[PDB]
Amino acid sequence: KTVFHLGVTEADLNGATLAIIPGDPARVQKIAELMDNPVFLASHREYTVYRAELDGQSVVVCSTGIGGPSTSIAVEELAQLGVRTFLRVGTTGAIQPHVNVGDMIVTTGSVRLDGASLHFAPMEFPAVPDFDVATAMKAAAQESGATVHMGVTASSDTFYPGQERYDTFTGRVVRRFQGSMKEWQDMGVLNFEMESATLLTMCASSGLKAGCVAGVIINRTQKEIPDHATLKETEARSIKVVVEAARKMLK
Amino acid sequence: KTVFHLGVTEADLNGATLAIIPGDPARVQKIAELMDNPVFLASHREYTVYRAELDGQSVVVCSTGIGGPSTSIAVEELAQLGVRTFLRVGTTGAIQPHVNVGDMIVTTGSVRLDGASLHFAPMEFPAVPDFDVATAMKAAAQESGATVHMGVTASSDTFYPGQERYDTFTGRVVRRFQGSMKEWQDMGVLNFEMESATLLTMCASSGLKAGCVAGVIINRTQKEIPDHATLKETEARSIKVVVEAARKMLK
Amino acid sequence: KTVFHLGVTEADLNGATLAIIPGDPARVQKIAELMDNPVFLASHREYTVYRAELDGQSVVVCSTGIGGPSTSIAVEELAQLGVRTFLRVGTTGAIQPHVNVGDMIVTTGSVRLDGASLHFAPMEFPAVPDFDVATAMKAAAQESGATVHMGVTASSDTFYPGQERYDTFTGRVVRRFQGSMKEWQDMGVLNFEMESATLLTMCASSGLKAGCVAGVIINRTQKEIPDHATLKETEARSIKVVVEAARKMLK
Amino acid sequence: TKTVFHLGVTEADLNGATLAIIPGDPARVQKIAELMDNPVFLASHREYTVYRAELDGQSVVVCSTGIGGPSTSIAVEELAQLGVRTFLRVGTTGAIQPHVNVGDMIVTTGSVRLDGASLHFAPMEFPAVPDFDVATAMKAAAQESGATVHMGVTASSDTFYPGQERYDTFTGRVVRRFQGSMKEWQDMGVLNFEMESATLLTMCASSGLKAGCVAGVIINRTQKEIPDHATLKETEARSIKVVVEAARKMLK
Amino acid sequence: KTVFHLGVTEADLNGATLAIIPGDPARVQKIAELMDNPVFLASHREYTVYRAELDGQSVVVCSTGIGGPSTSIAVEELAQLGVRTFLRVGTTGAIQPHVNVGDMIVTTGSVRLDGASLHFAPMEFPAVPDFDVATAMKAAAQESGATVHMGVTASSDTFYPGQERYDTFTGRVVRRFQGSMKEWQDMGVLNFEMESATLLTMCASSGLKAGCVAGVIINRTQKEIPDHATLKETEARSIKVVVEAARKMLK
Amino acid sequence: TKTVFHLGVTEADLNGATLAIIPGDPARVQKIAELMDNPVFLASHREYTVYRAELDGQSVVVCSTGIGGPSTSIAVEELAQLGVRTFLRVGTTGAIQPHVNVGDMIVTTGSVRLDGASLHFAPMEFPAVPDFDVATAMKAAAQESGATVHMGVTASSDTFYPGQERYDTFTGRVVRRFQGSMKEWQDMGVLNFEMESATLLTMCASSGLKAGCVAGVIINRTQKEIPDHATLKETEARSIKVVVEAARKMLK
Ligand SMILES: [Mg+2]
Ligand code: NA
Ligand code: NA
Ligand code: NA
């Protein structure tokens, strides 16, 4: 049996029960090649799927696309094929002045500024990671030598108005999001992204283990775009960290 | 300047003020080749971008990925580059017994079961198309010989629970969506999809003209696999119709 | 055999399946007299009911009163007596500078700033007209020689605070409505009125065909007071247009 | 001289009135006014019929509201622009509790806000409650008329049909929000449904205006008995007699 | 049967069907000693319980603690033991300039700025007192010679941000509550407290009779500080008044 | 020097404490304080009993909260004014999952916000989340005690009765919102019910304070509604030993 969107079967996964889920399809091969015997399985729409081996055990790498809706499809269909643990990796921009480019963020909870999380649990339910995944990500990030921040991420269904950007076609932000960035800053939120609220809510309410780790590639309060060397090193560290976190999760 | 995600410039669009926006990146070239002088511009993440010419005028074709969040990025960045009219095309499944495979649906309004629409307008605001775009889509659809339905579409941030699917890993649907498919059926809703609420709300509240047309490729109330020829013909007709609707909007 | 509020039976309607529904009881006779053989049927509370003949077919004219609640009663009771198509006519202000006194607006969707719409469908559902009624209204309005605007109407349960009027007894506007007129202006909304959200939501979710057309008699953004002659012409044109729209709907 | 936009009257037309009786039906306005002295028709436009009269020498307005919070909110606002500060709603109603009998009177102590226009004056958390002096005067007038009086909560709906959980309709459907709602209100002690009190009471309690509602019971949803015309006629007449006596107590 | 939190039995109550419910456990004995034969029953957590006799009838005095949650436990457990009428007494701060220190407020309805009221009735339901109890409280307060205000009270789940206090650890007030005190002032709200919305909603929806009376001990709009004698007199008058209101409720 | 408004203490009274242990019941404050060095009573007002003690040479406060978010929010605010930055909640809880046994410990990783006071600090979208170091210390302290420990989501209710879907009550009714809610939380993997963690965690996570919750299971709601009182005394004793050891780990 082949799932509707991902184009793979349970046999294709070789017994994997853990997936690493980047957003960008072009990063899938790069993550798989950090492990042993990487194998391309399928690519359709924003979903590129590889398998590889980590300490002898099969691991899936599957892209999600941008946003909760496309992420929710990938997580569901991988769970149909036996995956139980989901490690999100990416890079991100921080919104607090003490966070530096090259630091890592491990999300301990997300502000649910999305719609798909409500398709799994009502708004009162916390978008929080599994404690073992969060523990493994913190340990892998710390062992990398980076400075690590554990804290809250704001997870938005838009890149522009929901992150209170005004440098846009209309220059307008709807009332709900006017003043929102300052509010999140004053509440200690570390960063914005666009998938964690869906991922964490769907997994925490469905018997699946999930977490999110990200390397910081810009501080939005300072707007200092990194040189190429620093960007490359931060991107590389983020995926090396997520693979070591997967290693810590294997049983 | 090059826009942040799509990787194209205003010059690359060569004057285009109208975009055709399918979901799947692999459909972009297939739409572009119905027009004159198609040229590939860029491909990043779920976003593949071509230009072409229709009756001497430039037209962009840009994929959106699945879901309102990735759609909202593409629409905003194309608008930054001068695009003012957005024609969504795709194929869909219907939820009314009287709608047959091969028929076309032109959306007159969407049920906002998404999150990104709320980043542009509060829930009270109607997710409705531009009337000229809807009229052009109806005319083009009828001129193709298909049976056309004008009506309401339910636009969900998930494929599974928000469309009241129970054939899933948990088999559960949150309270909000229990009994929902029958509620929408009794309210005359024609079909589910995953992008129109975001697209139509964002455009109608932002000075952009938008509409949606889709070919019906399955009927969820019927238990019948369509033949391959009928599916191919319906896909081909959907994109012929959207290009003819673009020709009507330009003229 | 009589419905509870309107005081008419199905036999009194002489087979009519289409109603013209103004708000003011005193306008019912005026609209009826534009058609053939007008006959007074009943008057109770805000509900004055006539019948007339248009191209040989019976048409009902029934006032609604101000607001969604009284409107919802008239629509339901007429539907119980066999009416399936409802054409709302009136006159309105406008909130966009480009809309002039004497122009006409055909609503493509309503902002649901009412309560009664929620008694038919949850807020996510679009308050949108039937496409054939909106098309007939656009055609009748344009054929009259008026400048016609197709677009979104804000439909408020109040005349005063929900339209952000400060020339009131308290001069207070509740937080929800502070700044709201500029927000709707920036979102492209054309006008305020007080019944379309209820009408359009109720009908679109209940298998009834509805639409709304209005003549513009004042513009909130303009200082010039309209010539009383232009007001009289606009009132007369509005009802001539809705009768022609009814002619185009007859089968 | 300028007239208010919908009601078609000026402050001078009211002869100093600071109290209004506000029925829903325009045809009941003259019937209330004639219980007082020197009733005079002022205007009729749309659902708004307006009379003045005198009670113990003081001017009183009588003005219909139409059905629903939206048309009611217009009448209250425009009357308040002309100096009216106290608003007494009267009408007749069904009841949803078995202990409330036809011919009894209900004085609303608070309303379930199943409307929209109340939200245009105060967020949902705000209570739709009457002025305590108005409710007190209504209770005293009702008791002095010989009727059995019930003080309690009224459910105030923007619809007559689905919001009152009626299924005998064109579609036969009731939206999810209102499925099971009649039994829910019954178990919470709610006495009756009507269609204007949540708007009226929220608008007035948040705007420095005094308001209350009294109604004669003319049917009981929970009963099958059909009241005859003399009983309905008696209940309608008593309801307006009671509201005029309540106005007298407010003016004293 | 011994109720779980309050630690009393029906026999301990000696037939009482009326309770006076202050917030502070230390005030229970003081209230009981205004009546005949005061007897300590139990003390656990924030719940101190006495019985006394008033005109020969048993009355309970039971503290609630601060907040709707602890109040809801006390009311429920007393109702299990036969109590049907609940008279809340306390002292409060007023937010209207015309309300003076030493005046008394009888609540005619509460703004539901709490959470526990929603555990008994949806937000649309009015947090309103029983009319007999409010009438008895008005009469007792007026007969004492105090100036009495009947009106709306804002009932907050917090002492600090929900009363728009900025003199706090963070100085932050969440968006919902920014500007809120001026909005309640403009709406004619008399005072803030922290239990009435829960108490009134719970009782009104559960067949129990409840009301609230308070003496004003501070006014947030007035700079002048009240003297010690005025405060001691106001605290003493508040409890004398509630006992006289209980007398008026006995049957 | 001024005392805080409700707690009746000054910063000097706390001897520089930056960590508080916050039980609900005033009578348990002394029981926790006596597990540390040099316990001293500071104040008692309303439901707030406050002691100071010393742990490995560092000052620690113990302060009761009362039942519910509203009284808890006062105590946390006023302790934070006096320099407290870390808050360790200890208490008992009712488990809702069948695999959790009486006497097990639960460390909350996030709370379902079935309260009102959390909304006075952050909108509903914001996660009621503990500080990660506090949750890590609580888990380690609970494991080191020999207890079986569960990490997971807690449903945090403003009521004991209907919001925890209890039916053995005066009316026997539960409002629509909460009908079927316990099964819904069970199917979503929620471990337990209590009444303060949503307020505590949301207020601290949005205000620069570190907080966590640990609780001993005294009842399993898949079995019964009201708990039994033998290992309960034993469960309470182990829970407070665990929270003191978690405090030691946070101070190290
Ligand atoms: Mg730096
Ligand atoms: Na996507
Ligand atoms: Na009306
Ligand atoms: Na308490």
UniProtKB/TrEMBL annotation, chains A, B, C, E:
Binding locations of Mg(2+) 3: Q178
Residues bound to cytosine: E124, R175, R176
Superkingdom of source: Bacteria
Keyword flag Manganese: no
Binding locations of Mg(2+) 1: H44
Keywords on record: Cytoplasm, Glycosyltransferase, Metal-binding, Transferase
Family label: Belongs to the PNP/UDP phosphorylase family.
Name this polypeptide is given: Uridine phosphorylase
